[PDB]
Amino acid sequence: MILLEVNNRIIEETLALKFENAAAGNKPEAVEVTFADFDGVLYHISNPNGDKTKVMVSISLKFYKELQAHGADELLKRVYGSYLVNPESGYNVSLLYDLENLPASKDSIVHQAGMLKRNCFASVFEKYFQFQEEGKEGENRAVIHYRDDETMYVESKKDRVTVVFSTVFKDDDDVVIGKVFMQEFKEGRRASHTAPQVLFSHREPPLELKDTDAAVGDNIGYITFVLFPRHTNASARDNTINLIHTFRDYLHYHIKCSKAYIHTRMRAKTSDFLKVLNRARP
Amino acid sequence: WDDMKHLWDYTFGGVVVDSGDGVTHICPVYEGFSLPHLTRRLDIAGRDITRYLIKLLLLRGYAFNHSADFETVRMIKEKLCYVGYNIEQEQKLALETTVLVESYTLPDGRIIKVGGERFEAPEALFQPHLINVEGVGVAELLFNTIQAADIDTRSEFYKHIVLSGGSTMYPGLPSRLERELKQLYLERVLKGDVEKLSKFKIRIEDPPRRKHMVFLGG
Amino acid sequence: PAYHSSLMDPDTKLIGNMALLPIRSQFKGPAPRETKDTDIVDEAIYYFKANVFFKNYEIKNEADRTLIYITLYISECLKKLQKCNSKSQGEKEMYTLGITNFPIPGEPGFPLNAIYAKPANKQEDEVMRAYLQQLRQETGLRLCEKVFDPQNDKPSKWWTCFVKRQFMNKSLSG
Amino acid sequence: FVDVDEYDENKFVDEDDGAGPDEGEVDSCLRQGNMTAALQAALKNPPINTKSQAVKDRAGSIVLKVLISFKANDIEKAVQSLDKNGVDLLMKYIYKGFESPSDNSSAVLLQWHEKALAAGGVGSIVRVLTARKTV
Amino acid sequence: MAGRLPACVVDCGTGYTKLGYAGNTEPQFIIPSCIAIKESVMKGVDDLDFFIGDEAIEKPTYATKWPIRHGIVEDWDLMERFMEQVIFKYLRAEPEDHYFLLTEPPLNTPENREYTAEIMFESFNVPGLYIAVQAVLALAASWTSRQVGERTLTGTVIDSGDGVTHVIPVAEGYVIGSCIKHIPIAGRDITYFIQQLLRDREVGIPPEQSLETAKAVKERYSYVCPDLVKEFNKYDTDGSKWIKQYTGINAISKKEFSIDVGYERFLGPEIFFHPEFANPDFTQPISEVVDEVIQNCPIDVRRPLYKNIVLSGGSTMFRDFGRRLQRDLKRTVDARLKLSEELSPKPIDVQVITHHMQRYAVWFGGSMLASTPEFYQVCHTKKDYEEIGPSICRHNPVFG
Amino acid sequence: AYHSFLVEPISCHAWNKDRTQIAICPNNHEVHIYEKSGNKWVQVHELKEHNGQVTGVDWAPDSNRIVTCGTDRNAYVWTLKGRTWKPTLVILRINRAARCVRWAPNEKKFAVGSGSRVISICYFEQENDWWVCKHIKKPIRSTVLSLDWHPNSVLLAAGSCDFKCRIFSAYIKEVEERPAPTPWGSKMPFGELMFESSSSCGWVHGVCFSANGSRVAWVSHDSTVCLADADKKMAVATLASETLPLLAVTFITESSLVAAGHDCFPVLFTYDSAAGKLSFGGRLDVPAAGAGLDSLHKNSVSQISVLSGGKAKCSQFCTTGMDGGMSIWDVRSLESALKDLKIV
Amino acid sequence: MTATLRPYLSAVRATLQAALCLENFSSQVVERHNKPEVEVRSSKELLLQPVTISRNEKEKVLIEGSINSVRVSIAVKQADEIEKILCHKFMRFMMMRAENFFILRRKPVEGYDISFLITNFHTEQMYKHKLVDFVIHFMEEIDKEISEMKLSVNARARIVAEEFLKNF
């Protein structure tokens, strides 16, 4: 696994598994899982208000208010079509699946459901991709707090969008390693001509602060992605979105896996030393 | 007492520190007999060292069941467990090097690794608070015992201390008693003056035997 | 554990080292006439499917020794009944197989010679040979109504499946 | 309550029973063209015994000065001019210069070590570690 | 529960690995702990090119490896990669803001405990870690008796999943050392027996997949019978209803074959009480093993050990398994105490506990314990690792 | 000439009056005796009676008694009596572990040097039926490394760890009254310092005494060998080696000397009396077990002994190192092969 | 890169032949005790002169030999931050396995990145000259090994950027 997945495996495997057996005459057993996902996002699957042949998928995001104030619901309303209902009291969005209702394509109408951590975010980007395409020079930023100490800023310039991530490396050492990745990312044009531009600012913000106040510190790092019109178009809108919204988790993932790799190399060297030391005995 | 007859039949045909396995108790001797007004007892001997060792090993990640492995851990004590001379230094040795760490094979074939606890466990003899006992410790007790007795020939006592029993053969013990007693003979006789102790008088006994063969004339 | 026989009586006879148990039968031999509704052969047939898996067997009674011969014999019968096509045809094979001169204690070819007493004299010999044959005979015809199904030609696989299993890891054909 | 063995009687403390070399000599011969003569002069009359580090550090500073005042190909000729005893003392000073960072003083010293070693062998290095006579 | 977010619970077994989030009743994913690696010299992300679980036992262009043997981690590198994907693919939960609660088998060493900390803390910026012993987790997974309360961590856990049977005697939340016993009969062994018994009865069997049939019959039609002969008699008398039939389709052959299932139903699990029924080199019944184990423990916790016997693992799920244990063990112990008595202390109370969460009992116990606030105290903090060392994992204090 | 015994290093060893059997200690608490049977080596018995590593063993020629000393601060006098050997119990009254022991040319009293910063001189007493012992602390202070005895059964050489070689009197009111005839002073009383090192060289690992005892030699840790001659107005004669410091050493005649040590290979030194100076000249090590070194030892040699001919004209000598290997060297038939050899 | 590597390692090696050659030494202060003297330092006469060899202000080796033990310390060369942090993790990692090293200390002497603890028990169970070779080879391997790790990480970061970036 090089790339992180966009879709959620627990949802997709749970519903798919329940659905093939339902569409077989077999009764449905109760299910109760309260799992989560990358970042501050909860998830609940249950049998509601005394129900049973009711399943429902609910999501709780601590920062839902901010996404909603950017046309998040309006989009979800035209997404599920009719599988969107009220909230399970405690969870900002709820989907309700009636087993005596499904179509004739589960592996088709189930994949979307697995994508929830993405469809909530899609609206802000789609909205600014639209902005760029319209050329509206009068719309504010898009300050969205997804993490207790993390913020994303989205803005659509004259002819190119800009998605900025303010990420935190709690472990100081993680900073050095993280910098190495940035260096290689900066010189990406040497391999990709049609690849988004990336900027990086340490501690201080590029042109932030502002108005509003920007997070500053030895453990803070800023990454700016620059989206053009060839990626925000009506042909690469979704894609660019489904990809870009996983970047933060992608970076921390590769930093941690890099550390794991360093462990393997190091094992491969310390273990060898012991063999050489004993190779002097009988 | 009615269980003694079976024992007798069917068969045939100076200051002293004695530790066998139940407990030790210094016994001074003036003339040809002991001293009733003296002969103080210490509530800790061998079993306490094995038990404390079990607890310490538990702290190192070897979970020995207490009332199940006593003979094994006991057997482990009389082979590695020793008495430390300078606890600060021993602790330094344990933290900074691996020279104190030794491997031991258990009856089920498993090999474990034992280190600093080797000197930590017997230390309870000198620092009773370690096991929740309102004690004094071998050194302080011995000192107090000779010191509290008489004055006429105290020093003579000091020059004749002897170890006895299976639980006093721990390596470094004699040297430890002598040094710690030196510290007592300095922190209880002259709140200072580290230039008078150069005229000390004390040697730790304990030779190589276990034949308590007492007799004489007849 | 293995199932033993509870048919030993304080007045049960003995033919060398075994136990001359009564049976219900028209075949000739020195077996007493059984009046009760069950006998050693029924017991052996009843216990067989379970006992045959056992590798070890504690001899508690001289009745157990007889139970064992009959169990081993059931095995021999299954060996022959395996390859036949009709209940009537199988019966003929059983009669000939039982009438055979299978080895007896004391002879090589008989297993358990360390557990069975050999016949002390010629009389004891001939009489044990007659008992053994009468047990074989009654065991076999009785086994036919169990193996053969109401449907001609149909080796009850539920009996055939034991053809390879050897009680106590021994054999009368070995 | 505290060390008492340091106050034991059967203790072991070297006896300092029985300023420095010659600064001057390190001048006249340093040097109308004679580099070897300077080295042989600087290694004469080592302090030692003197508890104070002032005098010792003085001789060591001077010696290091001389060692630095040398070319590469001309070291070999000088070192080979010494007796078995001389190599050990030179060696003691080389190691001395390895205690402080006096600039490239180390760079040339490794050269000053291979060749010096070549004259007195590895045994000389042992004498430097086995001596209660300091430098 | 707790701080809104749920903790992570992972139980790594030789065969199946049970993973999920605390608070849940059943694991979220139970997958073989195999890992598929390449062979075509690390070159950049060449270490990330791997698959795990079922995805590791299907990739032809991939080599399947098994890091856990008899219960110990024997290959840490592969284990580390495995954990990479466990966290960043299946659980889908940040490791820098989600507590971890790994596990270990009894007889595991302190070194492994420390390694299980080096990986978790230095690669995964996790905030907290706890390492629980499987048998003890198996113990918590049982208070669910009838009514009411009565929590205890003194008892004997018989853990039989799919590899080998284990008889670890726990005491006051602490398992006994040389008190654990192994039996070379378990699930895997049970499947082989039933197979060898069918192969010599039914015909038209699956070529390279002749085990599947006997494998599917095991957990789906198997059960424990009381008296063998009475059961045999049952089948030989009232067939068609005592005897059942199972169908299926040929794997690497493609063919619809239907077979009858009979004696094997009870003969399969019967091997447990009669190893000599399939294992010619072992004949000691499980009841006797349990008894020997209890007798090797100290003369004082022995009776209590007899009073609280708990089950763990999928191989303990055959119907009336616990009941059969009660008959045989009560009979053996009474016979023993009978011998005692006659040559001249009240009968010893034996109790086998059988709850709902038997299969993945370890994980369930784990989820429940990791679900309480009282856990967010006993956990090792990032603060202690980042200053004191992996050594803090040498000892993992008990609670509950 | 080299034999590979165990895998560890031999702490010490000793040969009986008749170079036919060898006693060796493998860092254990029980000595092991081996014997040669034509062309093979055979185990005949293993003496066990020590609670610490045995660090010394010596054998007698006349009495035929073997004495051992160890870190368990104990010493026993083994004997024959049937097959199994029975050792006696001797109390040294020391809190340290013995580092070396030596009987005597006469075989009447042994000596054990110790970490108690003392030398224990032990002798038999037909009074209590036990073995006594007198202390000779002065002037030594630190642990004593190796000890040699004079051919008169009086003088005693000690290396010590204080970087100073000493010679002592073993006056025992049990053998003879006055002392013997030796240049070393005129009055030899019990407890007397006859000679002390003149240099501050490393610890003295080995010290031998001329066949007559008129000359004494010793090797320091500083890879140097000194020799003091009392017959030449107290000689200082020194030789600085270019290799690793040595350890054990013994006289072969009166001008030559064989030593070995941390260098692993054996070397010869010769003494020129006229100038009174020692010179170098290797070199018995020209190129069973393994292969890492081109010398007949794969680790340091820690003990050497003379087998026949005495210190005046040794013909065969043995050597044991930490490599756990024992070698016997013959300097006669090879001497001719050596395209370069002195000898006397 | 060298230009002065070999003379340095040669001098360290030479110091090591001289510094080793220990022997089983029972404690003279403590009854029945064999503690490593270079560590305990309770008998000054048992201590050798603490030497030191370095190629510059940052790279050096300290050797303070004794009769039954030798303590070696290394600093290694560390230019920028990534070499520093990589080094800290690696040295600490090895030290954690000290118990498995036999000749590795749990901690490094103040002022150095790593220190060794060779005792007479080692010269008994290992060829001392082959032990010395390990030190010289370790320095070259350790210094070189760290370089390979750096190259791997820097190289991999480019690839990590490419898989993400080409997918736009």
Q: Name the token pair of F218.
A: 């010793």
Pairwise CA distance, residues A267 & A265, whole Å: 5
Contacts of F339 (CB under 8 A, 6+ apart): none
- Touching E: which chains, 3+ CB pairs < 8 A? A, B, C, G
B40 in the same domain as B69:
no
In G, minimum Cα distance to D111 occurs at G7
Amino acid at F244: L
Residue E295 phi, psi (nearest 5): -70, -20
C-alpha pair distances (Å), D84 with each of D116, E28, F222: 11, 80, 14
Pairwise CA distance, residues D131 & F170, whole Å: 32
Indicate the annotated binding residues of B for ATP.
Answer: 20-22, 74-78, 165-170
Map tokens 């459901």 to a residue.
Answer: A113
Pairwise CA distance, residues C114 & C117, whole Å: 8
CATH fold group of domain D1-135: 1.25.40
Burial category of F196 from C-beta neighbours within 10 Å (exposed 0-12, middle 13-18, buried 19 and up):
middle
Pairing of strands B111-114, E68-69: unpaired
Burial category of A95 from C-beta neighbours within 10 Å (exposed 0-12, middle 13-18, buried 19 and up):
buried
C-alpha pair distances (Å), E208 with each of E54, E60, E199, E201, E203: 19, 17, 13, 18, 15
Task: Domain ranges for chain D, please list them.
Answer: 1-135
Among 3.10.20.30, 3.10.180.10, 3.20.20.140, 3.30.1460.20, name the CATH number for the domain at A1-131. Answer: 3.30.1460.20
Q: Name the token pair of A28.
A: 């449905």
Burial category of A75 from C-beta neighbours within 10 Å (exposed 0-12, middle 13-18, buried 19 and up):
middle
Pairing of strands E68-69, E72-73: antiparallel
Domain that holds residue B25: 14-44+134-218
8-state DSSP, F318: E
Residue A220 phi, psi (nearest 5): -100, 140
Length of chain B counted residue by residue: 218
Gaps in chain F with C–N over 2.5 Å, residue before each: 287
Distance from CA of B82 to the nearest CA of F (A): 14
8-state DSSP, E86: I
Pairwise CA distance, residues B209 & B207, whole Å: 6
- Which numeric CATH code is attached to G1-168? 3.30.1460.20
Residues G77, G9 contacting (CB under 8 angstroms):
no
Residue (of B15, B29, B31) closest to B138 by Cα position:
B15
Angle at C159 between CA C158 and CA C165, to 5 degrees: 110
Q: How large is the C-alpha radius of gyration of chain C?
A: 15
Residues A111, A7 contacting (CB under 8 angstroms):
yes
For chain B, positions 86-145, list CB contacts with chain G under 8 A: 89, 93, 95-99, 101, 113
Contact yes or no for G4 and D110 at CB 8 A? yes
Map tokens 């300050």 to a residue.
Answer: A143
Angle at G8 between CA G6 and CA G14, to 5 degrees: 100
8-state DSSP, E88: I
Report the DSSP beta bridge partners of residue A60.
Answer: A42
Pairwise CA distance, residues C135 & A80, whole Å: 81
Map tokens 């201390």 to a residue.
Answer: B161
Amino acid at E354: T
CB contacts, 8 Å: C53 with chain E: 267, 274, 277
Pairwise CA distance, residues E91 & A13, whole Å: 12
B contact test, residue of F94, F95, F117 with most B CBs within 10 A: F95
Map tokens 């490593």 to a residue.
Answer: G36
B139 in the same domain as B106:
no
SS3 B177: helix
Of G89, G96, G156, the CB nearest to E44: G156
B3 is a domain residue: no
Residues E50, E38 contacting (CB under 8 angstroms):
yes
Contacts of F32 (CB under 8 A, 6+ apart): F23, F24, F25, F26, F43, F46, F47
Omega of the bond leading into C24 within 30 degrees of 0 (cis):
no
Amino acid at A171: D
* DSSP assignment of F144-186: ---EEE-TTSSEEEE-TTTT--EEEE---TTS-SS----SS-S
SS3 E3: coil
Contact exists between A and C (3 or more beta carbon pairs < 8 Å): no
B66 in the same domain as B37:
no
Alpha helices in E250-357 (DSSP H): 264-270, 286-296, 302-307, 321-342
Q: Name the token pair of D131.
A: 């001596």
CATH fold group of domain A133-282: Yope Regulator; Chain: A, (3.30.1460)
SS3 A155: strand
Q: Could you give the domains of chain C?
A: 1-174 (1.10.1760.10)
Of F141, F163, F241, the CB nearest to D123: F241
Strand ranges (E), chain B: 15-18, 27-28, 102-105, 111-114, 162-164
Pairwise CA distance, residues B202 & A171, whole Å: 58
G68 at interface of B, judged by CB pairs closer than 8 A: no
SS3 E316: helix
Contact yes or no for E276 and C55 at CB 8 A? yes
Residues B53, B76 contacting (CB under 8 angstroms):
yes
Residues F236, F198 contacting (CB under 8 angstroms):
yes
Pairwise CA distance, residues C59 & B157, whole Å: 77
Q: How was this structure determined?
A: X-ray
SS3 A74: helix
Contact exists between G and F (3 or more beta carbon pairs < 8 Å): yes
Pairwise CA distance, residues B144 & B129, whole Å: 18
Distance from CA of D5 to the nearest CA of G (A): 8
Residue (of A185, A239, A188) closest to G168 by Cα position:
A239
Q: Could you give the domains of chain E?
A: 4-34+68-131+360-396 (3.30.420.40), 35-65 (2.30.36.70), 133-186+282-355 (3.30.420.40), 187-278 (3.90.640.10)
Provide the domain count of chain B. 2
- Last residue in a domain, options B117, B133, B149: B133
B189 is a domain residue: yes
CATH 3.30.1460.20 domain residues, chain A: 1-131, 133-282
Distance from CA of E277 to the nearest CA of C (A): 6
Pairwise CA distance, residues F67 & F71, whole Å: 14
Gaps in chain D with C–N over 2.5 Å, residue before each: 1, 18
Residue (of A201, A227, A15) closest to A108 by Cα position:
A15
Alpha helices in chain G (DSSP H): 5-19, 37-40, 81-96, 98-101, 120-125, 128-165
Q: Name the token pair of A42.
A: 């909860």
Map tokens 């000073």 to a residue.
Answer: D93
Amino acid at A229: P
Residues B46, B21 contacting (CB under 8 angstroms):
yes
Residue (of A155, A83, A68, A57) closest to A120 by Cα position:
A68
Residue (of F5, F61, F59) closest to F36 by Cα position:
F5
Contacts of F82 (CB under 8 A, 6+ apart): none
Pairwise CA distance, residues G52 & G12, whole Å: 9
In D, minimum Cα distance to G8 occurs at D110
Q: Looking at residue F185, which CATH number applies to its domain? A: 2.130.10.10
Map tokens 């602060």 to a residue.
Answer: A209
Dihedral sign (CA F312, F316, F320, F321): positive
Residue (of E71, F114, E384, E340) closest to G25 by Cα position:
F114
Report the DSSP beta bridge partners of residue B103.
Answer: B113
Q: Looking at residue B55, which CATH number applies to its domain? A: 3.90.640.10
Contacts of A211 (CB under 8 A, 6+ apart): none
Residue A273 phi, psi (nearest 5): -60, -40
SS3 E198: helix
Contacts of G53 (CB under 8 A, 6+ apart): D95, D98, G8, G11, G12, G15, G60, G61, G63
Residues C21, C67 contacting (CB under 8 angstroms):
no
Q: Residue E278 region, left (φ>0) first, then alpha (ψ -120 to 50), else beta?
A: alpha
Residues F307, F253 contacting (CB under 8 angstroms):
no
Provide the domain count of chain F. 1
Contact yes or no for E110 and B106 at CB 8 A? no
Q: Name the token pair of D44.
A: 């004469």
Contact yes or no for D4 and B187 at CB 8 A? no
SS3 E269: helix
Report the DSSP beta bridge partners of residue F43.
Answer: F34
Domain that holds residue F47: 1-344
Helices (H) and strands (E) in chain D, counts: 6, 0
Spell out the long-range contacts of G140-146 with Cβ–Cβ below 8 A and sequence spacing 24 or more.
Answer: G140/G9, G141/A269, G141/A273, G142/G74, G142/G76, G142/G90, G143/G76, G143/G77, G145/A269, G145/G90, G146/G76, G146/G83, G146/G86, G146/G87, G146/G90
Contacts of F129 (CB under 8 A, 6+ apart): none
Dihedral sign (CA E71, E76, E81, E86): positive
D121 at interface of F, judged by CB pairs closer than 8 A: yes
Q: Name the token pair of F198.
A: 């003149």
Pairwise CA distance, residues F209 & F192, whole Å: 18
B102 in the same domain as B33:
no
How do the residues of chain E divide into helix, strand and coil, expressed in percent and rounded to 5?
A: 40, 15, 45
> Directed axis angle between helix C62-81 and helix C87-99, to 10°?
130
Residues G87, G68 contacting (CB under 8 angstroms):
no
Residues F318, F331 contacting (CB under 8 angstroms):
no
Pairwise CA distance, residues C168 & E243, whole Å: 28
Dihedral sign (CA A168, A173, A174, A177): positive
* DSSP assignment of C136-161: HHHHHHHHHHHHS-SSSS---HHHHT
